[PDB]
Amino acid sequence: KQELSTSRQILSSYEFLGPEFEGLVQEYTRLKDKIKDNRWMLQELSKSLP
């Protein structure tokens, strides 16, 4: 009950920066996820050179 109360207090400070910020955060998050996927794909092709 104490941990839930602290986390809910911090989230309330970011939610105050508007929908536009949330859009940016969503975009950033999407891009980081694609970079992570491409790096992961390059690593898997090198192990296969027999």
35 binds another protein, rule: CB under 8 A = yes
Q: Which two tokens stand for residue 30?
A: 């999407």
Instruction: Please name the residue that has the structure tokens 């999407």.
Output: 30
Q: Which two tokens stand for residue 44?
A: 């898997």
CA angle 38, 35, 39 (to 5 degrees): 40
Residues 5-34 vs another protein: string with x where CB under 8 A?
A: --xx-xx--x--x--xx--xx-xxx-xx-x
The footprint of another protein (CB under 8 A) covers: 4, 7-8, 10-11, 14, 17, 20-21, 24-25, 27-29, 31-32, 34-35, 38-39, 41-42, 45
